[PDB]
Amino acid sequence: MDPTIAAGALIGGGLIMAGGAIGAGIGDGVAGNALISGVARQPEAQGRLFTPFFITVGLVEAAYFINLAFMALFVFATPVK
Amino acid sequence: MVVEYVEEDIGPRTLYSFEPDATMLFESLLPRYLTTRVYAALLESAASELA
Ligand SMILES: COc1cc([C@](O)(CCN(C)C)[C@@H](c2cc3cc(Br)ccc3nc2OC)c2cccc(OC)c2F)cc(OC)n1
């Protein structure tokens, strides 16, 4: 009955936050790995390397936050009902 | 050639990139260094002979 939809939001919602964290978690890694090396090669670059870095992270973090929002929309709104 | 470790000079220095790598470049540059030394020797000898 209605419970079968409830878990359908808890499972699906969980998925929305699984692929979210694998997305940001690795993204912020593979982006930050290019910052450290950069700063490791010339310390005076830390001033300007934040201009590309905080762009990529921005994009990456968007992919997370949207999913975050959707997870709420799955757990606190249950659209298909 | 004698290897003498003179100083540090640069500590937080912007590191050099080597293409393809440092060792191959070094072993390809050493004979050029020897021959430019021999060239400078020949030039100094010519000037000395004229003097
Ligand atoms: C709430 O859902 C979103 C979605 C989006 C985007 O999908 C990008 C998501 N990434 C940043 C993780 C975005 C987008 C779609 C594209 C589509 C093609 Br075809 C080609 C390039 C595209 N490039 C884009 O931006 C880089 C987009 C989409 C719609 C309206 C938009 O206006 C507000 C809008 F910006 C951003 C967002 O911000 C909170 N919320």
Curated annotation (Swiss-Prot), chain B:
Protein name: ATP synthase gamma chain
Assembly description: F-type ATPases have 2 components, CF(1) - the catalytic core - and CF(0) - the membrane proton channel. CF(1) has five subunits: alpha(3), beta(3), gamma(1), delta(1), epsilon(1). CF(0) has three main subunits: a, b and c.
Superkingdom of the source species: Bacteria
Family: Belongs to the ATPase gamma chain family.
Record organism: Mycobacterium tuberculosis (strain ATCC 25618 / H37Rv)
Disulfides per UniProt: none
Gene designation per UniProt: atpG
Localization per Swiss-Prot or TrEMBL: Cell membrane
Coiled-coil region: none
Parent-record interval covered: 205 to 255 of 305
Function: Produces ATP from ADP in the presence of a proton gradient across the membrane. The gamma chain is believed to be important in regulating ATPase activity and the flow of protons through the CF(0) complex.
